[PDB]
Design an enzyme around this catalytic site. Structure first.
Site, PDB file in Angstrom:
ATOM      1  N   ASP A 173      -9.489  -6.857  -4.263  1.00 55.51           N
ATOM      2  CA  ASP A 173      -9.084  -5.722  -3.429  1.00 55.51           C
ATOM      3  C   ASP A 173     -10.133  -4.625  -3.612  1.00 55.51           C
ATOM      4  O   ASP A 173     -10.305  -4.103  -4.714  1.00 55.51           O
ATOM      5  CB  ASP A 173      -7.719  -5.202  -3.893  1.00 55.51           C
ATOM      6  CG  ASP A 173      -7.146  -4.134  -2.976  1.00 55.51           C
ATOM      7  OD1 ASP A 173      -7.922  -3.347  -2.398  1.00 55.51           O
ATOM      8  OD2 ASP A 173      -5.903  -4.077  -2.850  1.00 55.51           O
TER       9      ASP A 173
ATOM     10  N   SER B 196       0.820  -1.208   0.000  1.00 55.02           N
ATOM     11  CA  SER B 196       0.000   0.000   0.000  1.00 55.02           C
ATOM     12  C   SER B 196       0.861   1.269   0.000  1.00 55.02           C
ATOM     13  O   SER B 196       1.672   1.467  -0.908  1.00 55.02           O
ATOM     14  CB  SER B 196      -0.904  -0.057   1.243  1.00 55.02           C
ATOM     15  OG  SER B 196      -1.936   0.906   1.211  1.00 55.02           O
TER      16      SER B 196
ATOM     17  N   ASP C 291      -2.432  15.531 -13.190  1.00 56.02           N
ATOM     18  CA  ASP C 291      -2.538  14.082 -13.290  1.00 56.02           C
ATOM     19  C   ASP C 291      -2.818  13.364 -11.958  1.00 56.02           C
ATOM     20  O   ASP C 291      -2.675  12.142 -11.875  1.00 56.02           O
ATOM     21  CB  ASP C 291      -1.249  13.537 -13.919  1.00 56.02           C
ATOM     22  CG  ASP C 291      -0.751  14.408 -15.072  1.00 56.02           C
ATOM     23  OD1 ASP C 291       0.343  15.014 -14.949  1.00 56.02           O
ATOM     24  OD2 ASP C 291      -1.461  14.496 -16.094  1.00 56.02           O
TER      25      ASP C 291
ATOM     26  N   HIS D 267      -7.109  -6.633  -0.249  1.00 56.43           N
ATOM     27  CA  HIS D 267      -6.039  -5.688   0.043  1.00 56.43           C
ATOM     28  C   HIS D 267      -4.965  -6.254   0.972  1.00 56.43           C
ATOM     29  O   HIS D 267      -3.778  -5.960   0.811  1.00 56.43           O
ATOM     30  CB  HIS D 267      -6.625  -4.397   0.627  1.00 56.43           C
ATOM     31  CG  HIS D 267      -5.693  -3.226   0.555  1.00 56.43           C
ATOM     32  ND1 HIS D 267      -5.164  -2.770  -0.633  1.00 56.43           N
ATOM     33  CD2 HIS D 267      -5.208  -2.410   1.522  1.00 56.43           C
ATOM     34  CE1 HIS D 267      -4.392  -1.723  -0.396  1.00 56.43           C
ATOM     35  NE2 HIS D 267      -4.402  -1.484   0.904  1.00 56.43           N
TER      36      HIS D 267
END
Ligand code: MG
Ligand code: MN
Length: 254
Positions: free
Chosen positions: A207, A102, A184, A235
């Protein structure tokens, strides 16, 4: 057998756990509000201690790296990336591989891009190089810790106490949502082309926090990378499917 300690790095006393006697040094980077204690129990226990020397660090403000308290400046991922590499250098490792989960995966990508001569190989999962509207709404739905499941809140509430856990989670949401407003919605899209080491991107197809397109994007721009999809993974795939994950990581690192 695991040893916990602190080392002075960039003005802070960072906490970490270490195990193993192997010649291949590996750093485990935790996710949001994570620590070695809450994010890597299975790895600190089962990763091959003969092949690797494993270190799990606590980013400043997380785990036991307190003080200081956690804050999220615009460059917070870059700050963690520097602290992570400086910590391993402080522990005398000449080169290391990175296993980032993560926020830790985002951190690892940045570290590999900025300090290429120091990174051997990398395995990351559940990371995203930029923030979209979909992501932003997912984060907002995490802000309120009282709505978290009892199982997910328990370990963090015990580690930080309700107050710090709740406040830091809100600061994290605001901290990661800030990237949406940059061109972006960028976090590290620009650093992906600068990663020079072999990388394995693992993604749990189920996930609910990170859509697969983020894993596809990282795979697309990290040259020579490999993408591995786990149909049942979510996840926390390295915890729920620890044996499967550890094998994938060990095989890739060798
Ligand atoms: Mg663009
Ligand atoms: Mn710790």
């Amino acid at each position: 057998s695991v040893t916990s300690a602190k080392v002075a790095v960039n003005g802070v006393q960072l906490h970490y756990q270490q195990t193993g006697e192997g010649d291949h040094a590996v750093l485990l980077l935790p996710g949001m509000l994570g620590s070695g204690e809450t994010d890597f129990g299975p790895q600190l226990k089962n990763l091959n201690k003969k092949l690797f020397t494993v270190v799990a660090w606590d980013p400043r403000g997380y785990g036991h790296s307190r003080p200081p308290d956690r804050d999220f400046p615009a460059d917070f991922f870059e700050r963690d990336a520097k602290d992570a590499v400086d910590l391993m250098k402080a522990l005398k490792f000449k080169k290391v591989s990175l296993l980032g989960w993560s926020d830790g995966g985002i951190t690892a990508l940045i570290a590999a891009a900025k300090y290429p001569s120091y990174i051997h190989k990398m395995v990351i999962w559940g990371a995203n190089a930029y923030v979209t509207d979909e992501d932003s709404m997912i984060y907002e739905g995490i802000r309120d810790v009282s709505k978290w499941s009892e199982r997910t809140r328990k370990p963090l509430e015990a580690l930080y106490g309700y107050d710090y856990f709740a406040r830091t989670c809100e600061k994290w949401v605001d901290g990661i949502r800030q990237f949406k407003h940059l061109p972006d919605g960028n976090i590290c899209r620009h650093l992906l082309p600068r990663v020079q080491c072999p990388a394995l991107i693992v993604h749990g197809e189920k996930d609910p926090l990170v859509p697969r397109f983020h894993a596809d994007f990282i795979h697309k721009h990290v040259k020579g990378s490999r993408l591995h999809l786990m149909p049942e993974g979510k996840h926390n795939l390295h915890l729920r499917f620890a044996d499967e994950f550890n094998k994938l990581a060990e095989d890739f690192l060798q």
